[PDB]
Design a protein around this nucleic acid. Structure first.
Ligand code: MG
Ligand code: MG
Ligand code: MG
Ligand code: MG
Ligand code: MG
Length: 906
RNA sequence: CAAGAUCCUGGUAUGCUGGGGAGCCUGAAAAGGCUACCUAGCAAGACCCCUGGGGUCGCAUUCUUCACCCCCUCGGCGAGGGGGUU
DNA sequence: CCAGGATCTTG
DNA sequence: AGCTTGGTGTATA
DNA sequence: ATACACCAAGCT
């Protein structure tokens, strides 16, 4: 089932996306777009709030579990040591709250002459010290902990502050003595400060160190006169700690293969999608003869570096619009970026030629650079300097600050001191960190007395993801006969599109969202696939030519500001002649909707089973009146089934409204369990809230996010009714379905699971009547194709959105209640509408009506009724292959299905 | 040539729930609250090895399970991975 | 939150 | 009654 | 710090 063709693979790697293209080639010209797909991934991020990956959250949870296990073992070993020593540990209950602290205080203060009292207090103090021992460096052993200075300087400062605050001296000032005195004198005080957030003054302000607890134990030891072997064993049992080793990590040579993971989340996401696309494309067209990849400036930078980027652009664009409005009030017709550079240099140097004195006006500017552009310089803000005209024609191609000291009319050795002693202002182009970096880089470029080479321009992407992708693609190329694999950076495909008259907005018929300036190509998510298609045309020579054109354009962007020279190469001419039909192929592919935007499905039932907060159980009387919500909150499944048989003897599911009085107060109400009998005065355990919850560890926890929704269809074949059974991981956990050999989308859920407990009442009644059967399953990230008919059940904000954005494909994002599915548009970007909200907030009247609707619509998107979505005839739930084609044949992979015509399972 | 980027390992301090209670505030028929502090647990659980106890795994690898193909590790025989075209 | 490993990949 | 929309809790450092 | 699930008044 394979025919070999000549084709090239284009890979457009992004932070949350990757664009893949298989383009057929005939005579070094594009012939047919075999495949073009944009795949959207999360970057491996599991916690969206903190940016931590799924692997990082799993590792932190695993290490917390290991910490609890070894803490249990260590406390048990201390308990055996205390039993051997005859010292009674602190009891679990029926003791005073301050017994441990007064035991520590009394043992560090006075010698106890009673034998049993001393052993009891010693056991109390030692057990409580092992429960609260403070922090130490984990790579330092017990002996080196014993050799630390005792007490630490942090506890010495804390003890001095406590002595000054409370006007009392405790001798010796140990942590147990001070905490016992504070709990006896100012009750309700809190010892350690609370992270993550009324005038309760905290007793301690620094982190407790292990040497402080060790010194307190030494003071207790030498006050009570304990034997040294006993003290050594107590220290070895309390402060024992496993060393930080490397058990889990494994931490010409062969290149890593496609199936080998690199361990970095976003790179694994991109590589998994790329290896699936490459395997499908090789099985259907044979191997490619060329593979071209680029990587964006993201996907490697940290969240801190992202915060540096947004902290740069907000201050820079505020300063540019401020002096642009000042230049518009100054009479200049066209405000321009180099005019903003010279206005910044007058905002900073206060109109001062350094080399000539002579404060100037706007006419005698004549902007010049410190380093000449032929001699390694560029149009950087550090290199640019304010001039006076007379301080412009005197440099004369010579090195800066080298001929100047060996000449008249100007002096050196005060330039560095004068720049470095200047004051950082409040609001300007640079921030507080960027102004220090600007001053240090200016001084470093002022320190030149010789050549500072050179005018380097040869860009191939060499980051971690870049080298990993090059090694794996070169391994595939050696295994499959690919002629060349080229990985670029930037920044080059935008050039290749703008010199080929390819605009995403014209290509996909996108309405204008910005009132002025150029519309962004990043609004439509298919632009990644278009850039992959364009990337198939690139060769390293023409990529270097386009980079040269971009660099000469941004060099002359400020030169002609106070342009644009076209590329001049036979390779560029041959490439532009060869890519004449690429545009016609792009409109031909876009008009027939062949380009798809898809996301991978998370089908494995792994992750957080429930929420992490334990909650208190409620109690309800058996003989009292039961409402529908109180019957829904019944914790024990046998009692739940017995009350279900009470409210309906033939029924299997609970058919209750949440607010309805289901069954009244009956005084001889008796509930017959299989092994117990519940009297009318007995108390039934209830979940605290009327939502999905499970029993974990003697408490109640809410269910986590839904793993999937099982789609049920009932009614007539021409007017069917639809509902969703939202199944979280807690339903699978309490149903015993998290074992081997279980299809989690079709395995039967018991009625007491929160899925059937909190299903819609129409669905529950139809399943009781036998009319409703499961016709499919929906996961977050499934694509709903509404067909050429589109959405016909729009109302209000969705109507106003679909007037400008007739979106046919929608992505399932969640199931926010029992009758609703949350749908976002597949082709429309997320970061574009988010930062578009930010532009409307800061800048008024800058967005067209469509842009305003997009901004006010994208946060919640289409919180859609299921009955108004699945009632569309011709709606298809599209499960793409790796090439972006909908899987329609029934196999052992998820296939596309139509909710109106899906046959029920089994 | 530093810093990071990804984890990994060992720890700490809170927080939540259950069991308690030092002080305060109510209710006094008795048991409710607040601030702290003490103590146990902190995914559900699975698999060992010996009515419990102890040891290791259990939130990653985005198409679960099933079925086919490929790669790797150990001794047909299980685990790790990978791919599956519409 | 803390220290510190191992490894890449930039140069 | 039923769909729309606004607002908020969520283990964390 | 997110975005998904839940809760609770508005329009119709
Ligand atoms: Mg404890
Ligand atoms: Mg401790
Ligand atoms: Mg792109
Ligand atoms: Mg405690
Ligand atoms: Mg446990």
């Amino acid at each position: 089932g394979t025919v070999p063709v000549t084709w090239r693979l284009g890979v457009d790697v992004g932070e949350r996306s990757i664009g893949l293209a298989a383009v057929s080639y005939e005579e070094d010209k594009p012939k047919e777009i075999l495949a073009a797909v944009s795949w959207i991934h999360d970057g491996g991020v599991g916690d969206e709030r903190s940016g931590a990956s799924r692997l990082a959250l799993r590792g932190m949870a695993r290490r917390a579990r290991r910490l609890r296990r070894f803490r249990r073992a260590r406390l048990r070993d201390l308990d055996m040591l205390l039993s051997e020593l005859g010292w009674t540990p602190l009891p679990d209950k029926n003791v005073s709250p301050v017994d441990a602290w007064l035991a520590r205080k009394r043992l560090a203060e006075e010698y106890v002459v009673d034998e049993t009292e001393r052993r009891r207090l010693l056991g109390y103090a030692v057990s409580h010290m092992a429960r609260h021992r403070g922090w130490r460096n984990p790579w330092t052993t017990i002996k080196d902990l014993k050799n630390l200075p005792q007490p630490s300087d942090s506890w010495e400062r804390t003890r001095e502050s406590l002595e000054a605050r409370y006007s009392v001296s405790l001798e010796p000032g140990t942590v147990g003595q001070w905490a016992g005195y504070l709990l006896q004198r100012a009750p309700g005080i809190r010892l350690n400060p609370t992270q993550q957030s009324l005038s309760n003054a905290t007793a301690f302000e620094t982190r407790l160190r292990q040497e402080d607890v060790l010194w307190e134990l030494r003071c207790i030891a030498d006050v009570q006169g304990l034997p040294e072997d006993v003290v050594s064993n107590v220290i070895d049992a309390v402060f024992c700690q496993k060393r930080p080793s490397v058990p889990a990590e494994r931490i010409r040579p062969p290149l890593p293969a496609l199936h080998e993971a690199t361990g970095h989340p976003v790179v694994d996401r991109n590589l998994a999608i790329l290896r699936k696309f490459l395997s499908s494309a090789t099985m259907r067209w044979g191997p490619p003869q060329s593979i071209v990849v680029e990587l964006a400036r993201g996907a490697s930078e940290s969240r801190e570096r992202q915060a540096e980027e947004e902290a740069a652009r907000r201050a820079h664009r505020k300063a540019n619009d401020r002096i642009r409005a000042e230049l518009r009030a100054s009479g200049l017709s066209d405000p321009s970026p180099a005019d903003l550079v010279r206005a910044r240099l007058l905002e900073l140097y206060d109109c001062h030629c350094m080399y000539c004195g002579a404060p100037i006006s706007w006419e005698n500017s004549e902007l010049d650079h410190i380093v000449p552009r032929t001699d390694g310089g560029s149009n950087r803000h550090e290199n640019l300097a304010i001039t006076c005209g007379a301080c412009n024609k005197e440099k004369g191609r010579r090195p800066f600050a080298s001929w100047a000291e060996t000449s008249n009319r100007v002096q050196l050795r005060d330039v560095i001191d004068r720049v470095q002693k200047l004051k950082y202002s409040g609001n300007m182009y640079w921030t507080r960190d960027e102004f220090s970096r600007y001053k240090k880089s200016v001084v470093a470029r002022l320190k030149r007395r010789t050549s500072d080479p050179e005018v380097i321009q040869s860009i191939e992407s060499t980051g971690y993801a870049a080298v990993a992708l090059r090694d794996r693609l070169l391994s595939y190329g050696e295994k499959n006969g690919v002629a060349q694999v080229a990985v670029f950076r930037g920044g080059v495909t935008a050039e290749a599109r703008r010199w080929l008259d390819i605009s995403i907005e014209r290509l996909f018929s996108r309405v204008a969202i910005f009132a002025q300036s150029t519309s962004t190509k990043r609004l439509d998510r298919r632009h990644h696939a278009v850039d992959a298609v364009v990337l198939t045309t690139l060769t390293p020579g023409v990529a270097k030519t386009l980079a040269d054109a971009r660099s000469r354009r941004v060099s002359a962007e400020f030169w002609r500001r106070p342009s644009t020279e076209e590329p001049q190469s036979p390779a560029y001419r041959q490439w532009k002649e060869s890519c004449s039909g690429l545009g016609d192929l792009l409109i031909s592919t876009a008009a027939r909707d062949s380009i798809a935007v898809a996301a991978p499905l998370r089908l494995r039932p792994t992750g957080a089973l429930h929420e992490e907060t334990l909650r208190a159980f409620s109690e309800h009387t058996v003989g009292a009146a039961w409402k529908g919500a109180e019957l829904r909150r019944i914790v024990e499944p046998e009692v739940y089934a017995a009350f279900l048989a009470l409210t309906d003897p033939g029924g299997r599911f609970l058919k209750v409204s949440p607010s309805e009085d289901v069954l009244p107060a009956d005084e001889n109400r008796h509930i017959v369990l299989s092994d117990r009998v519940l009297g009318p005065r007995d108390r039934v355990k209830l979940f605290p809230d009327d939502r999905g919850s499970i029993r974990v560890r003697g408490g109640a926890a809410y269910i986590a996010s839904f793993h999937h929704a099982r789609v049920f269809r009932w009614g007539s074949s021409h007017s069917p009714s639809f509902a969703l059974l939202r199944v979280s991981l807690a339903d699978l956990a309490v149903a015993g379905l998290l074992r081997d050999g279980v299809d989690v989308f079709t395995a039967e859920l018991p009625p007491w699971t929160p899925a059937w407990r909190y299903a819609s009442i129409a669905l529950v009644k139809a399943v009781e009547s036998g009319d409703a059967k499961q016709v499919g399953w929906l996961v977050p990230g499934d694509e709903l194709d509404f067909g050429p008919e589109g959405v016909t059940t729009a109302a209000g904000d969705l109507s106003m959105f679909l007037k400008y954005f007739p979106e046919r494909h929608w992505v399932v994002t969640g199931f926010e209640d029992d009758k609703r599915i949350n749908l976002k548009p597949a082709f429309l970007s997320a970061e574009q509408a988010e930062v578009l909200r930010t532009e409307r907030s800061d800048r008024p009247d800058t967005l067209t009506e469509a842009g305003e609707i997009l901004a006010q619509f994208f946060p919640r998107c289409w919180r859609a009724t299921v009955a108004k979505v699945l009632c569309h005839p011709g709606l298809t739930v599209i499960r793409r292959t790796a090439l972006g084609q909908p899987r329609w044949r029934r196999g052992h992979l998820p296939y596309s299905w139509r909710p109106w015509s899906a046959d029920p399972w089994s």
